[PDB]
């Protein structure tokens with residue numbers, strides 16, 4: 001049935017995961033660079049960490065979904 | 072079949088409750104009041120997933 005994952009669906013999710021892995025890498029590096037520059041811009045820590053967290057959380061969900069889909 | 076979709080669904084629920092309990096733990100003492108209800112739900116889902124997987128595996132053998 002349409003509900004169940006297909007090779008086509010898996011290929012698409014793989015594609016989404018790869019674009020997001022790049023974006024996640026960007027936030028990782030930006031957070032790293034923030035920490036390395038401390039104390040400058042310490043007021044930006046929580047915001048930057050939240051943004052970074054959200055992208056990695058989404059990435060982790062999709063990766064776990066992909067594994068389950070592939071099956 | 073199609074136990075497989077049913078196992079897939081529990082697999083996902085199990086993964087989410089794992090995340091939820093992990094986060095709740097790391098966040099302590101915040102929401103310590105929610106520990107037992109979350110553990111009970113997580114246990115129920117993993118138990119049911121365990122059994123259903125065993126069933127699918129007798130099936131498919």
Ligand code: NI
Nearest residue numbers: 093094096097
């Ligand atoms: Ni942890």
